[PDB]
Symmetry: C2
Subunit: 181 residues, 2 copies
């Protein structure tokens, strides 16, 4: 009963819904493991894979659907109302999605298209002014590059991009590394 019903819920969702649900699951499935999920059913399988979703274990499904405001699916397939879910989530700790993620999603729902363009513009303003100070030595800079994830054992792209403009011999070293690995 549960499995077929989860299939029906799987089909009733559109793209925007899947994006939202992919976001609201980031507490359990890292960013790194979200490219594999292309449709809602694969997300269901990956959620049950961590035993966060089972028959008689629908807390997280109910919460997810309420947050993305698909109350029609809650009623049609889960027999759950809005006020019931509000009562459930307003009792401390019963909410399973972090306040961080819910905050971000609600910021997203409040924003229009024009306001989104404003956000892109302002974010490109604040990014086009990153300031690493003058007291960081090179090794620290490599550590920051690994931190901001632009350099790694298998991401020599940017490192080669800068070294190629500094001096070739460095690029020679890098090529020796990646060609002997």
């Amino acid at each position: 009963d549960f499995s077929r019903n989860l299939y029906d819920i799987g089909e009733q969702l559109d793209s925007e819904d899947l994006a939202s649900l992919k976001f609201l699951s980031l507490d359990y499935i890292p960013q790194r493991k979200q490219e594999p999920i292309k449709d809602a059913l694969m997300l269901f399988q990956r959620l049950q894979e961590k035993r966060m979703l089972e028959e008689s274990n629908l807390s997280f499904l109910k919460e997810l659907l309420f947050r993305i405001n698909r109350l029609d699916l809650l009623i049609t397939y889960l027999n759950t109302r809005k006020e019931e879910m509000e009562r459930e989530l307003q009792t401390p700790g019963r909410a399973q999605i972090s306040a961080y993620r819910v905050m971000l999603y609600q910021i997203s729902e409040e924003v229009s298209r024009s306001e989104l363009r404003s956000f892109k513009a302002l974010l490109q303003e604040e990014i086009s002014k990153c300031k690493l100070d003058d007291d960081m030595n090179l090794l620290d800079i490599f550590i920051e590059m690994e931190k901001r994830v632009i350099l790694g054992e298998g991401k020599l792209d940017i490192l080669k991009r800068v070294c190629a403009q500094i001096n070739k011999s460095l690029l020679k070293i890098i090529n020796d590394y990646e060609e002997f690995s």
Copy 2:
């Protein structure tokens, strides 16, 4: 005697050496547990803590000293020559530092101060590459903000800074989040 000698070697090293050796130890001691390590002798203690450095087990100590080209300490206190260590590390696998880390360190050794200026400039160029195409919705933008590590569970500065220029209600959301933590 072993402890006394390791103390003497511990004090003979300067700051640049400690930075280098701290880097070349990143295969075993994560970034996070290196702020506690403030001096070279403490680094020795943290190396013995993981039993990669023992009495009669100096492979990694010798390797460390050779890499940072402190051959004077190798000879003075360890009675070990340059060419012997070269033979040691050129025998496969006996070098204990990964080719990645050693590659980064030699890139560091080759670079002058001016060339480092060029590296800072070019890297600030590549970070100020915005991407942010017209098909990314807000949530994706949040995910890249977390990537470039300018947004996080406890780093709401930039997010509030942009929302304050878009519309206050967003700022109200963020403040409600962080004052509820």
